[PDB]
Amino acid sequence: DISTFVIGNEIENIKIQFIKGQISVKEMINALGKSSVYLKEFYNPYPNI
Amino acid sequence: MLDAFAKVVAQADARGEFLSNTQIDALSKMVKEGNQRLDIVNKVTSNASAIVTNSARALFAEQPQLIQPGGNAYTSRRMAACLRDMEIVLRYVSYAMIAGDSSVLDDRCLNGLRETYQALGTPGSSVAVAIQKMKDASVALANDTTGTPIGDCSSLVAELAGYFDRAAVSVV
Amino acid sequence: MLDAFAKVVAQADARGEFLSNTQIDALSKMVKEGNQRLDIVNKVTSNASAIVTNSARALFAEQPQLIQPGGNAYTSRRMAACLRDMEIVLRYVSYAMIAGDSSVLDDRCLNGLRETYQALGTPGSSVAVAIQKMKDASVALANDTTGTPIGDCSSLVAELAGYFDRAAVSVV
Amino acid sequence: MQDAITSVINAADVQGKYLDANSVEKLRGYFQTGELRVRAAATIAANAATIIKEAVAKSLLYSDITRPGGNMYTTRRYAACIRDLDYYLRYATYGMLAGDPSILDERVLNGLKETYNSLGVPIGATIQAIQAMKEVTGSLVGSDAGKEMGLYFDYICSGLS
Amino acid sequence: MQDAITSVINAADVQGKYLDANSVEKLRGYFQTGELRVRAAATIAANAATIIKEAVAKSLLYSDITRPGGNMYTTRRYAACIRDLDYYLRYATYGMLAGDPSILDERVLNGLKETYNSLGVPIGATIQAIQAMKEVTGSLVGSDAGKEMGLYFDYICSGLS
Amino acid sequence: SGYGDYSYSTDRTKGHVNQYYV
Amino acid sequence: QILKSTKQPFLESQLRFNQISIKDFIKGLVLSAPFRDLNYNVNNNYRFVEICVQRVLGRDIYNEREKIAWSIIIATQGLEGFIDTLLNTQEYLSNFGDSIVPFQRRRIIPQRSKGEMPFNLKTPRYGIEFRSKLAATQFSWASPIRRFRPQEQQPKAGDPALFLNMVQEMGPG
Amino acid sequence: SIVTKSIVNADAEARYLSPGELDRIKSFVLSGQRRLRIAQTLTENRERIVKQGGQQLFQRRPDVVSPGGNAYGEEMTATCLRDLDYYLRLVTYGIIAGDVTPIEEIGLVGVKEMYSALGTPISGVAEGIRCMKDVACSLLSGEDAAEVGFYFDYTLAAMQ
Amino acid sequence: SIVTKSIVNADAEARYLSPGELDRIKSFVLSGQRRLRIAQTLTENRERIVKQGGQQLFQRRPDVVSPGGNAYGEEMTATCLRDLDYYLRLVTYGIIAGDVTPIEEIGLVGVKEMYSALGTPISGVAEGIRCMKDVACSLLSGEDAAEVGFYFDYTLAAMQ
Amino acid sequence: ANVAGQEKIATISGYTWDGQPQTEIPGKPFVKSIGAMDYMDGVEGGDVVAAKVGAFWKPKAPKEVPYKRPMGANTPELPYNTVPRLV
Amino acid sequence: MKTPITEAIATADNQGRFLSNTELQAVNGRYQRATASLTAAKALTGSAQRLITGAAQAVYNKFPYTTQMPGPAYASSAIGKAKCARDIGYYLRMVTYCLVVGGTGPMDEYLVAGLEEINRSFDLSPSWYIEALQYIKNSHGLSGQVANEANAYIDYAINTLS
Amino acid sequence: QLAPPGIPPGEDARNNQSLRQYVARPVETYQKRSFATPLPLTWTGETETVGAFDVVVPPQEKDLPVSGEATSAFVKYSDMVRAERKAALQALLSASAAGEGRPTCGAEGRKFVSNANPVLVNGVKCVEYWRK
Ligand SMILES: C=CC1=C(C)[C@@H](Cc2[nH]c(/C=C3N=C(/C=C4\NC(=O)[C@H](C)[C@H]4CC)C(C)=C\3CCC(=O)O)c(CCC(=O)O)c2C)NC1=O
Ligand SMILES: C=CC1=C(C)[C@@H](Cc2[nH]c(/C=C3N=C(/C=C4\NC(=O)[C@H](C)[C@H]4CC)C(C)=C\3CCC(=O)O)c(CCC(=O)O)c2C)NC1=O
Ligand SMILES: C=CC1=C(C)[C@@H](Cc2[nH]c(/C=C3N=C(/C=C4\NC(=O)[C@H](C)[C@H]4CC)C(C)=C\3CCC(=O)O)c(CCC(=O)O)c2C)NC1=O
Ligand SMILES: C=CC1=C(C)[C@@H](Cc2[nH]c(/C=C3N=C(/C=C4\NC(=O)[C@H](C)[C@H]4CC)C(C)=C\3CCC(=O)O)c(CCC(=O)O)c2C)NC1=O
Ligand SMILES: CCC1=C(C)/C(=C/C2=NC(=C\c3[nH]c(/C=C4\NC(=O)[C@H](C)[C@H]4CC)c(C)c3CCC(=O)O)/C(CCC(=O)O)=C2C)NC1=O
Ligand SMILES: CCC1=C(C)/C(=C/C2=NC(=C\c3[nH]c(/C=C4\NC(=O)[C@H](C)[C@H]4CC)c(C)c3CCC(=O)O)/C(CCC(=O)O)=C2C)NC1=O
Ligand SMILES: CCC1=C(C)/C(=C/C2=NC(=C\c3[nH]c(/C=C4\NC(=O)[C@H](C)[C@H]4CC)c(C)c3CCC(=O)O)/C(CCC(=O)O)=C2C)NC1=O
Ligand SMILES: CCC1=C(C)/C(=C/C2=NC(=C\c3[nH]c(/C=C4\NC(=O)[C@H](C)[C@H]4CC)c(C)c3CCC(=O)O)/C(CCC(=O)O)=C2C)NC1=O
Ligand SMILES: CCC1=C(C)/C(=C/C2=NC(=C\c3[nH]c(/C=C4\NC(=O)[C@H](C)[C@H]4CC)c(C)c3CCC(=O)O)/C(CCC(=O)O)=C2C)NC1=O
Ligand SMILES: CCC1=C(C)/C(=C/C2=NC(=C\c3[nH]c(/C=C4\NC(=O)[C@H](C)[C@H]4CC)c(C)c3CCC(=O)O)/C(CCC(=O)O)=C2C)NC1=O
């Protein structure tokens, strides 16, 4: 969970936008994966392979 | 039974802490309201016979089976017990208005009442209709000017309406 | 309430027969051990405040969350009611030792104590730890000579530990 | 992922025989302790944050893994601990209800000691945290319930060792 | 290489504590079966060649591993089998006396399945030979002794799988 | 691997070992 | 709740000087401030009737409708009219009168070994209803004393501090 | 730093660094002389910046130090100032790195989990950093106080 | 134990266990009741067997405890008795295992490398175990303390 | 939940120590107490220092305009001589 | 608790009637005094740590045997000294609760009920805590009606201990 | 049967209640009253209590001077390892060999490791079936 590797200010943009029903699940996952919380963990420390 | 001021003391004793500086400044706004919280309690106490009787009469006009023979408010002893119950719920709502906290209301009045009306046969969906009629008679009487200076009491009649809604969903 | 002499009479009465010759001789051994039973009880009541306070002090050292703010033995009144429980259990364990039967201990002390603590929210596992500290504080003061003649009180301190174990199991 | 009933049914099924007197004998033994496990899992759910706060303050909060250079220095690293200790107190609760530690090695133990060696997490301080966490858990649920919940803590400590 | 007493002493020593009631409780359980294991190891030593002759004739004697092309065709390859089956019946006897299967993986299991894959020895026929060898061993030593000797055969079959 | 990250050697720390007097 | 914060030393003085009776002493203990703080403020109107029937009248509630029937005396007349009505029943005056302290009447059958769960244990001061609003907890948050380094107060098993003091004998004898 | 995340930005995009990225690595390294002077001021003023930092913190939040507060007694108050020495140190890292990347992964990521799990009021520690900010910006000119204060308020933002 | 090395003996020789090996596993397990009674005596006499063990050790070797000795002060003397508690524990293992195999691979293999590398006089620790032996055999009869004797002097032999 | 209570943002009704749900009226779970503080404005992010919720730069309007008017075509429907039940 | 507000509800509840003008005047008098009460509670909180470490030192100056005598009841260890200052902080915290609430209700409930039974059981002396509260009465530094409200609840604690 | 508990039979209030305003009577029994709690039997000759004549203090470290097939078993045993062990005892003492190499642990740490069990290194003999 986001808890131990986020600061709080990162993806509340996406949560409140999803809790209100404004975006479906797939947009929520795509907007989740293309946030800098993801590349700070799954793109930075590993190679492209 | 504890007021708005003793509620934040009881919450801080469970942590074993002193009060914060923002907690003391938020209690200085409840002192600043003050005089007009006492205006609302004065206006629903001075009309307490007419809040009950006008909203009892309005209840048996929409639900005439309550006073038909066999109905729950049919006898002299059962009719005088419906008006006694409306006068008690109105009493503990005005206690909770002057305290700033619904703790006198749901320890002395609302606790165990849903399970009591079910043991007696009293329709709790109809008690809630009689509470919601006393709410409209109280908030229409809370925001009339009539001897008070003009100002904004809108955040205090939103709290008075919230006590009536709490008593009406905990009765059924 | 019945002691060890009245329990062999109550069991022989439901058979409808006199006590045998070996049942009188087993009761004559309990009369000969009477002065040593009276010095178990004399040592645990002459030190009653030291069994309770030293075992409470050893409990909040081991379980220090009970006296934290918000805790179970946190206030002056919940601390005094905690020492009241340890003093009541030591009173009724000492009543069962002078009788020889744990009848008074579970007629009027352990009768419904497990469900008292569940309605209150008191942790019954920590009350059992506190009883076990009063136990070995009491069996250590039982087999020291210190004003008694020397002899074997080994089967009497095994019985005294049996009422302490009966109380600790019956509470959780 | 088998409970006591699943493990009893598996062993009785794996020989193709019915549930004889010995298989039901253990099942009756599990149903007797069914009342104890729920109340044990009840209070542990209530005092989850309080138990973990008590364990770390009693075992490794006063140390030099907490100080700079120690294994727990940065706030991300400290926050990972109580996240990490939450699983041990949580999965141990599952083993206490299921009555079988199969869920632990299925979902906790496998690749765990091999993971801490990768990160460089001290296994020595980890077990003492769980041991201290086992000590406070016996405070809440009582003696025998603590014996049950404690029986899965050292199972984690044994395999994690 | 630990027996039941060595394993009990190790676990009681690894925590630095003395041999409490639980450690001696298992040790007393091992000494009770000490009389059964020797007589079990007695008859197995006597009928070593007879047991292996019974297992191969009952499991894989006439199957097409025995015929040309099968894994056991040439006389060197056939002679390696009864040499190979002798270790399983022998080391299982050691585990039955020591009461602990540590000697098996120490001296038999490690590098075993990795060796048969190198030679191309069929692990499927190997386990059924040991299963048939386990079946005849329960004939000689009795039921409970066969349960003891049988408890280490499938340990070999499990790890060799 | 970051502005705060662990290396074993820079750990000067009686926590992999556990002499509890420090 | 027999504390000297809850003693009533002036009710005691009027009982010693024969001014009030025991019926007035029993009434004054129910209307006292410790009884309203510790008992009346943590019960609803139905469980408090069960407490005051068990402790004043000495017997158990007949059924769940006796609790309903008497709880409306507290809501309309207050607590002072409820204990006047209870003390003036003929059940009270035939048993205790005005000179006897109440007790749990007929708790145990003459030849039996067990009793009927004495009433201070059957109903403690709060229950399941009210218990949730005001029970206590186990381990709150309060930032306590840290006991400082804390294993070390119970040395861990190998370790040579258990033999400290036994080094002590060592010399002479 | 600005150098490492201007790289990992252009790293992810499969491209090199634009003039917009390379005229700022250039602009940052010429700024490096002025950054070390600013961090050098806060380096040997930690005695006053921390001790006066906890000065206003207790005057504004006496609850945290009063009996029952988290930082009560001789013990916790020492650790009460220890954290301020931490966060004052990370601001010196952010000034030299030209970014809150050092402050990000140290003392900011998951900080609410730590302080909530320690029983500390996270709003209280935010008040402590604000008190340090007024002491820090009082030690520097206006051109510098727009930087040294600039990193504190980011720490204030992430700490609530 | 006698069970594990009577196996690994016959294991290496490609054979089963002879009557000479199986009439002694048999003879050892019937001896098992008497062994636990002997180890049970030394188990809860470690307070006296160790204390009084270090009693005669210092009276016979005051150098090791005198200023300059390895076990000098409150600290080392506690560890000075800690090792005796170790070796007294291993003798309880050897009595129950019926052999010094537990004592062999614990406290005996490479023991001279440890104590030489700790600066401890290995002859001094040998004197300590001999003092424990007289206390231990004074707590038991006839043959019992004879078997649980033979184990101390084996430790004496390997410790020099 | 402990942070919200510790911050005086809002007290969250949790569980008692054995794990039964907390409640002020014993009928249903998680009922809360109310009064003189949930209707008072200006303290919404109270004790969260420098909180900025909504238009903090202006005092809100009084909005003391209480009147109920005829709600044509959406006055709620409910039976006569009755009051509706529910399951 | 015993507040000025709940002693007004209770007076009306004890007879089963509504809140009259007798009870609105008592609640109004709480609101006039609350301005001086909430500035005293804010000022005792703001200087609480410097008031507790000073008052524990005032006890050790007057009763120096408490730092020298061995035994569990005395502050002759680092654990006993932390439990002494824990108790001074309990007494100061209840005072600032009584100033916020407006009556002697928090410390009646949390502190003074059962206090004599603890000091008899655990061998603590009420003269230690009187000396600690006479320090805070003379060293809080308030003046005016702010100091009148703070001293009115400090003197309530000295009267229960004595 | 009867009325439910408390209800005066014949004065029920739900006699001719309308169905639209009818409320189902909750179920309540005589359990939670104290008169219906089950007491101990105590006229069939059974009290639930416990006291003297119950507790026994059993010595279970000390069952007896232990059985003859532990001592008679025993003294056979160390007649059969006695010749073993003292052969193995002064196999240690004047096996006082010299020292090779450099001391790698303080002053010890030479070529051979102290008291190493030679059976382990020497007992696992590698063997080739058809050795060649
Ligand atoms: C009997 C109880 C009782 C009291 C309330 C106080 C009575 C009281 N209320 C107000 C004062 C007031 N009272 C009100 C109240 C209201 N104005 C409205 O238009 C609403 C209808 C109503 C709120 C529901 C307001 C708004 C003020 C302040 C005047 C203003 O804001 O302009 C004042 C003037 C004092 C001052 O403003 O400093 C006094 C004496 N004393 C008492 O004994
Ligand atoms: C009113 C209070 C009251 C008492 C306390 C006893 C006191 C008491 N105890 C004993 C007598 C005794 N008391 C003990 C008891 C003990 N010895 C020990 O070593 C143990 C520590 C302890 C076990 C509990 C023993 C063993 C004797 C008998 C001495 C003997 O062996 O002859 C005697 C002499 C009579 C006799 O020897 O039988 C008396 C008067 N009697 C009383 O009337
Ligand atoms: C507006 C519509 C309307 C209804 C239909 C009734 C529905 C109804 N019937 C009964 C009540 C009853 N209904 C029956 C019915 C029957 N008796 C039998 O033996 C046969 C099964 C069947 C006759 C045909 C009986 C016996 C009772 C009494 C139940 C009792 O008192 O135990 C009750 C409970 C209250 C009462 O005591 O009357 C209600 C709500 N009431 C309404 O308000
Ligand atoms: C002709 C000479 C002759 C004998 C002397 C005995 C000798 C003898 N005693 C026992 C064996 C025994 N004998 C006893 C008897 C007792 N233990 C007590 O403490 C009591 C005093 C007594 C019972 C009243 C017990 C308990 C054992 C079992 C010993 C064990 O636990 O191994 C056995 C083995 C089994 C048996 O036969 O009992 C033998 C052969 N038998 C003989 O044939
Ligand atoms: C906790 C504070 C509190 C409350 C609120 C309370 C209510 C209460 N209402 C009762 C009865 C009653 N209550 C009602 C009320 C109604 N029936 C209707 O049809 C209407 C919908 C409604 C009136 C608006 C009636 C008719 C009775 C009499 C029932 C009977 O006579 O059997 C009774 C039974 C005793 C009696 O009145 O004779 C109690 C105890 N008791 C309390 O202690
Ligand atoms: C004579 C037979 C008898 C027994 C046995 C008995 C027990 C008993 N213990 C009680 C409370 C209590 N019991 C404890 C005890 C403890 N809490 C802890 O955390 C510790 C683990 C433990 C002891 C150290 C406490 C703190 C209370 C007060 C609960 C409360 O009032 O909130 C109550 C609640 C009623 C009241 O306080 O008014 C009863 C009836 N009463 C009896 O009449
Ligand atoms: C459910 C079974 C399960 C477990 C147990 C688990 C553990 C686990 N612990 C981790 C890290 C960690 N774990 C710790 C823990 C500790 N530091 C100490 O000093 C203590 C000894 C210990 C706390 C008890 C720390 C500090 C990290 C962060 C390491 C780093 O950032 O390099 C990580 C790296 C990723 C992350 O935390 O997001 C995993 C995957 N995963 C699982 O699926
Ligand atoms: C570099 C980033 C970073 C931070 C911030 C950090 C904090 C941190 N604060 C701690 C304790 C603490 N922190 C406080 C703090 C406070 N009390 C108050 O009243 C104030 C509101 C507040 C300070 C301004 C207290 C009282 C403790 C001790 C808590 C206890 O003993 O239970 C501890 C545990 C003890 C220790 O190892 O120091 C850590 C790890 N670690 C880090 O790596
Ligand atoms: C189970 C087998 C076993 C042994 C024997 C053993 C040896 C052993 N003895 C040690 C130290 C020590 N042992 C001793 C004991 C002695 N000094 C004297 O004066 C005497 C001659 C002698 C006892 C008779 C002392 C003094 C030290 C500390 C040496 C130092 O601090 O340099 C240590 C390091 C300290 C520690 O571990 O905490 C070890 C490992 N440990 C084991 O696990
Ligand atoms: C919130 C209401 C409240 C109060 C008032 C309270 C007092 C209180 N103080 C205690 C102990 C103590 N109090 C002291 C204090 C002192 N001794 C000295 O020598 C100093 C002069 C003095 C400091 C002024 C000490 C040393 C102990 C420990 C005594 C013991 O462990 O027996 C204990 C015994 C339990 C424990 O060890 O914590 C209680 C219950 N507890 C409460 O919950």
JSON list of N, CA and C in Angstrom, two decimals, chain C residues 4 7-8 14 27 30 100-103 106 155 158-159 163 166, chain L residues 42-53 55-57:
[
{"chain": "C", "resi": 4, "resn": "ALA", "atom": "N", "xyz": [-15.27, -29.16, 55.07]},
{"chain": "C", "resi": 4, "resn": "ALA", "atom": "CA", "xyz": [-14.89, -30.52, 54.74]},
{"chain": "C", "resi": 4, "resn": "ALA", "atom": "C", "xyz": [-15.61, -31.54, 55.61]},
{"chain": "C", "resi": 7, "resn": "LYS", "atom": "N", "xyz": [-19.22, -31.80, 54.12]},
{"chain": "C", "resi": 7, "resn": "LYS", "atom": "CA", "xyz": [-19.33, -32.36, 52.78]},
{"chain": "C", "resi": 7, "resn": "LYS", "atom": "C", "xyz": [-19.39, -33.88, 52.82]},
{"chain": "C", "resi": 8, "resn": "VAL", "atom": "N", "xyz": [-18.72, -34.51, 53.78]},
{"chain": "C", "resi": 8, "resn": "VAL", "atom": "CA", "xyz": [-18.83, -35.96, 53.90]},
{"chain": "C", "resi": 8, "resn": "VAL", "atom": "C", "xyz": [-20.14, -36.36, 54.56]},
{"chain": "C", "resi": 14, "resn": "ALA", "atom": "N", "xyz": [-27.28, -38.41, 51.09]},
{"chain": "C", "resi": 14, "resn": "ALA", "atom": "CA", "xyz": [-27.90, -38.83, 49.84]},
{"chain": "C", "resi": 14, "resn": "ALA", "atom": "C", "xyz": [-27.74, -40.31, 49.57]},
{"chain": "C", "resi": 27, "resn": "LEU", "atom": "N", "xyz": [-11.47, -38.24, 59.28]},
{"chain": "C", "resi": 27, "resn": "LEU", "atom": "CA", "xyz": [-11.79, -36.95, 59.86]},
{"chain": "C", "resi": 27, "resn": "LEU", "atom": "C", "xyz": [-11.03, -36.68, 61.14]},
{"chain": "C", "resi": 30, "resn": "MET", "atom": "N", "xyz": [-7.90, -34.95, 60.14]},
{"chain": "C", "resi": 30, "resn": "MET", "atom": "CA", "xyz": [-8.11, -33.54, 59.87]},
{"chain": "C", "resi": 30, "resn": "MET", "atom": "C", "xyz": [-8.25, -32.72, 61.14]},
{"chain": "C", "resi": 100, "resn": "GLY", "atom": "N", "xyz": [-11.67, -26.06, 54.41]},
{"chain": "C", "resi": 100, "resn": "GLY", "atom": "CA", "xyz": [-11.28, -27.28, 53.76]},
{"chain": "C", "resi": 100, "resn": "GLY", "atom": "C", "xyz": [-12.10, -27.61, 52.54]},
{"chain": "C", "resi": 101, "resn": "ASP", "atom": "N", "xyz": [-13.00, -26.72, 52.14]},
{"chain": "C", "resi": 101, "resn": "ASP", "atom": "CA", "xyz": [-13.85, -26.92, 50.99]},
{"chain": "C", "resi": 101, "resn": "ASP", "atom": "C", "xyz": [-13.99, -25.59, 50.27]},
{"chain": "C", "resi": 102, "resn": "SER", "atom": "N", "xyz": [-13.87, -25.62, 48.95]},
{"chain": "C", "resi": 102, "resn": "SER", "atom": "CA", "xyz": [-14.02, -24.41, 48.15]},
{"chain": "C", "resi": 102, "resn": "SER", "atom": "C", "xyz": [-15.47, -24.13, 47.82]},
{"chain": "C", "resi": 103, "resn": "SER", "atom": "N", "xyz": [-16.33, -24.13, 48.82]},
{"chain": "C", "resi": 103, "resn": "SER", "atom": "CA", "xyz": [-17.75, -23.92, 48.61]},
{"chain": "C", "resi": 103, "resn": "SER", "atom": "C", "xyz": [-18.11, -22.45, 48.72]},
{"chain": "C", "resi": 106, "resn": "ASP", "atom": "N", "xyz": [-16.83, -20.23, 45.63]},
{"chain": "C", "resi": 106, "resn": "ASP", "atom": "CA", "xyz": [-17.56, -20.15, 44.37]},
{"chain": "C", "resi": 106, "resn": "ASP", "atom": "C", "xyz": [-19.06, -20.01, 44.53]},
{"chain": "C", "resi": 155, "resn": "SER", "atom": "N", "xyz": [1.29, -30.94, 52.52]},
{"chain": "C", "resi": 155, "resn": "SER", "atom": "CA", "xyz": [0.00, -31.18, 51.90]},
{"chain": "C", "resi": 155, "resn": "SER", "atom": "C", "xyz": [-1.02, -30.10, 52.21]},
{"chain": "C", "resi": 158, "resn": "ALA", "atom": "N", "xyz": [-0.18, -27.36, 49.48]},
{"chain": "C", "resi": 158, "resn": "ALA", "atom": "CA", "xyz": [-0.65, -27.83, 48.18]},
{"chain": "C", "resi": 158, "resn": "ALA", "atom": "C", "xyz": [-2.14, -27.61, 48.03]},
{"chain": "C", "resi": 159, "resn": "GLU", "atom": "N", "xyz": [-2.88, -27.66, 49.13]},
{"chain": "C", "resi": 159, "resn": "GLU", "atom": "CA", "xyz": [-4.30, -27.37, 49.11]},
{"chain": "C", "resi": 159, "resn": "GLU", "atom": "C", "xyz": [-4.56, -25.87, 48.98]},
{"chain": "C", "resi": 163, "resn": "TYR", "atom": "N", "xyz": [-6.84, -23.60, 45.81]},
{"chain": "C", "resi": 163, "resn": "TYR", "atom": "CA", "xyz": [-7.88, -22.59, 45.77]},
{"chain": "C", "resi": 163, "resn": "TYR", "atom": "C", "xyz": [-7.45, -21.36, 45.00]},
{"chain": "C", "resi": 166, "resn": "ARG", "atom": "N", "xyz": [-7.98, -22.45, 41.46]},
{"chain": "C", "resi": 166, "resn": "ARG", "atom": "CA", "xyz": [-9.40, -22.51, 41.15]},
{"chain": "C", "resi": 166, "resn": "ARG", "atom": "C", "xyz": [-9.95, -21.12, 40.85]},
{"chain": "L", "resi": 42, "resn": "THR", "atom": "N", "xyz": [-27.39, -30.75, 45.09]},
{"chain": "L", "resi": 42, "resn": "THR", "atom": "CA", "xyz": [-27.35, -30.65, 46.55]},
{"chain": "L", "resi": 42, "resn": "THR", "atom": "C", "xyz": [-28.50, -31.28, 47.35]},
{"chain": "L", "resi": 43, "resn": "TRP", "atom": "N", "xyz": [-29.45, -31.93, 46.69]},
{"chain": "L", "resi": 43, "resn": "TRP", "atom": "CA", "xyz": [-30.33, -32.86, 47.38]},
{"chain": "L", "resi": 43, "resn": "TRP", "atom": "C", "xyz": [-30.17, -34.28, 46.86]},
{"chain": "L", "resi": 44, "resn": "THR", "atom": "N", "xyz": [-29.58, -34.44, 45.68]},
{"chain": "L", "resi": 44, "resn": "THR", "atom": "CA", "xyz": [-29.05, -35.70, 45.20]},
{"chain": "L", "resi": 44, "resn": "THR", "atom": "C", "xyz": [-27.65, -36.01, 45.71]},
{"chain": "L", "resi": 45, "resn": "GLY", "atom": "N", "xyz": [-27.17, -35.32, 46.74]},
{"chain": "L", "resi": 45, "resn": "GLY", "atom": "CA", "xyz": [-25.91, -35.69, 47.35]},
{"chain": "L", "resi": 45, "resn": "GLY", "atom": "C", "xyz": [-24.70, -35.22, 46.59]},
{"chain": "L", "resi": 46, "resn": "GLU", "atom": "N", "xyz": [-24.73, -33.99, 46.10]},
{"chain": "L", "resi": 46, "resn": "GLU", "atom": "CA", "xyz": [-23.70, -33.46, 45.21]},
{"chain": "L", "resi": 46, "resn": "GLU", "atom": "C", "xyz": [-23.64, -31.97, 45.46]},
{"chain": "L", "resi": 47, "resn": "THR", "atom": "N", "xyz": [-22.54, -31.46, 45.98]},
{"chain": "L", "resi": 47, "resn": "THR", "atom": "CA", "xyz": [-22.40, -30.01, 46.01]},
{"chain": "L", "resi": 47, "resn": "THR", "atom": "C", "xyz": [-21.32, -29.66, 45.00]},
{"chain": "L", "resi": 48, "resn": "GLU", "atom": "N", "xyz": [-21.43, -28.47, 44.43]},
{"chain": "L", "resi": 48, "resn": "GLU", "atom": "CA", "xyz": [-20.50, -28.08, 43.38]},
{"chain": "L", "resi": 48, "resn": "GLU", "atom": "C", "xyz": [-19.16, -27.60, 43.92]},
{"chain": "L", "resi": 49, "resn": "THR", "atom": "N", "xyz": [-19.01, -27.48, 45.24]},
{"chain": "L", "resi": 49, "resn": "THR", "atom": "CA", "xyz": [-17.84, -26.85, 45.82]},
{"chain": "L", "resi": 49, "resn": "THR", "atom": "C", "xyz": [-16.67, -27.82, 45.93]},
{"chain": "L", "resi": 50, "resn": "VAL", "atom": "N", "xyz": [-15.54, -27.31, 46.40]},
{"chain": "L", "resi": 50, "resn": "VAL", "atom": "CA", "xyz": [-14.29, -28.06, 46.50]},
{"chain": "L", "resi": 50, "resn": "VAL", "atom": "C", "xyz": [-13.51, -27.52, 47.69]},
{"chain": "L", "resi": 51, "resn": "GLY", "atom": "N", "xyz": [-12.88, -28.42, 48.44]},
{"chain": "L", "resi": 51, "resn": "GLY", "atom": "CA", "xyz": [-12.12, -28.01, 49.61]},
{"chain": "L", "resi": 51, "resn": "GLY", "atom": "C", "xyz": [-11.13, -29.06, 50.06]},
{"chain": "L", "resi": 52, "resn": "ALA", "atom": "N", "xyz": [-11.02, -29.26, 51.37]},
{"chain": "L", "resi": 52, "resn": "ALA", "atom": "CA", "xyz": [-10.27, -30.40, 51.87]},
{"chain": "L", "resi": 52, "resn": "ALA", "atom": "C", "xyz": [-10.94, -31.68, 51.42]},
{"chain": "L", "resi": 53, "resn": "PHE", "atom": "N", "xyz": [-10.14, -32.76, 51.37]},
{"chain": "L", "resi": 53, "resn": "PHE", "atom": "CA", "xyz": [-10.45, -34.07, 50.80]},
{"chain": "L", "resi": 53, "resn": "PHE", "atom": "C", "xyz": [-10.40, -34.05, 49.27]},
{"chain": "L", "resi": 55, "resn": "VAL", "atom": "N", "xyz": [-7.75, -31.74, 47.51]},
{"chain": "L", "resi": 55, "resn": "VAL", "atom": "CA", "xyz": [-6.40, -31.42, 47.07]},
{"chain": "L", "resi": 55, "resn": "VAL", "atom": "C", "xyz": [-5.42, -32.48, 47.57]},
{"chain": "L", "resi": 56, "resn": "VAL", "atom": "N", "xyz": [-4.61, -32.97, 46.64]},
{"chain": "L", "resi": 56, "resn": "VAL", "atom": "CA", "xyz": [-3.53, -33.89, 46.92]},
{"chain": "L", "resi": 56, "resn": "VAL", "atom": "C", "xyz": [-2.24, -33.22, 46.49]},
{"chain": "L", "resi": 57, "resn": "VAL", "atom": "N", "xyz": [-1.19, -33.38, 47.28]},
{"chain": "L", "resi": 57, "resn": "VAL", "atom": "CA", "xyz": [0.10, -32.81, 46.93]},
{"chain": "L", "resi": 57, "resn": "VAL", "atom": "C", "xyz": [0.98, -33.92, 46.37]}
]
